[model samples]
Target: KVFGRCELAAAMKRHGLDNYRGYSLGNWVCAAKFESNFNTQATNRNTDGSTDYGILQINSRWWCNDGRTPGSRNLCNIPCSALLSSDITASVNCAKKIVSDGNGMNAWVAWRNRCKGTDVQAWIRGCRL
Candidate 1:
């Protein structure tokens, strides 16, 4: 398990995810909900054969390495397994870098499809953070 709503919010706030790289906190939270359902250990096999890893469901096509793939760019230079930890420091850093390089939250398809322009107040509702 990763985190409950409040716990997730606190962590995001601590990481300055409320507005990292000009993306909203709700966008981040909503992406996590659709991508991994907050499960840090989450992994999904993409149709292209690359796998998406962790809470952000970061693609192996350009991010972290799964070790089985040769010539993996692995811009994050971290193993995919590292993103499955409860300590999300590494994942958060990777995500920040992704947003910086890509079209902000548009880097995440889930965010583009589900979170973009949507009101995500419920994501942080009642969370003290």
Candidate 2:
């Protein structure tokens, strides 16, 4: 599922991403825009042979076990496939876990390079939060 910008913003806020681990809804909004463009089924294979899945781009090696990334920790204890669901609940939950695990939003390099330490507020400026 592809979400409109405001639609994705509302969903992230509803899922308690606002002010999550010192990051605001705008940060999530910005990161998602760059990572997957609010796509629920986005995937990118890493050079390490792992994969990123979902709008938040949860990884197969560090977060979810794809049964292919050998030695995957499955820190979220979720199947990598679950992250691709249009519902997004699993993806939301795992993202929270990633932050709690001390990685913060930096777990996604896209967030650091494209969203972090940047004026992310503009990403959700017109969205009804």
Candidate 3:
């Protein structure tokens, strides 16, 4: 995983997410911080039994297939495991598609629950980017 928030933000910027979907870089960084703590391999099972995968925690119910799960919409046409890699290209692409579908960052419960109205500047506090 990345060493800290600044590195995470740099990686996201290199992945072309600095200003993606009209949201500020801080929003992406904050969501990533809360959703996965910058660990691409992070995974969590939701109360509804679906699992969230990767940095953005793309949901198995709609975004990608986790194989074991049934009835995945698979809108991103990717395996959920792909998002678990350190290479975040797939995850970023899937996140872009998800946001384009009108969900925006609202697609992530982490964003709504932890970052929606919070001060996101801390996510890039020392990045100087």
The worst-scoring run of ten residues by lDDT in candidate 2 lies at 99-108
For all candidates in order, the CA lDDT equals 0.85, 0.90, 0.84
Please write out the lDDT profile of model 2 over residues 1-129, one tens digit for every residue: 999999998999999999998888899988899999899999999999999999999889888989899988998998999999989889999888888876688878899998888999898888777
Candidate 3, 1-129: lDDT as tens digits: 543788878878887887788777889998998888888889999877789998888999998998866777898999899999878889989888988887788977878999888887678887766
Question: Which parts of model 1 are misplaced by more than 4 Å?
Answer: none
Clashes of 3: 0
Q: Model 3 Cα displacement at 87 (Å)?
A: 0.7
Over the stretch 16-116, how does candidate 1's per-residue lDDT look in tens digits? Answer: 78888777677788889999999999998877778998999988888998976666799999998898889878889999989999578888898899988
How many Å off is the CA of 96 in candidate 1?
0.2
Question: Who wins the TM-score comparison?
Answer: 2
TM-score of each: 0.94, 0.95, 0.90
Global local distance difference test of model 1: 0.85
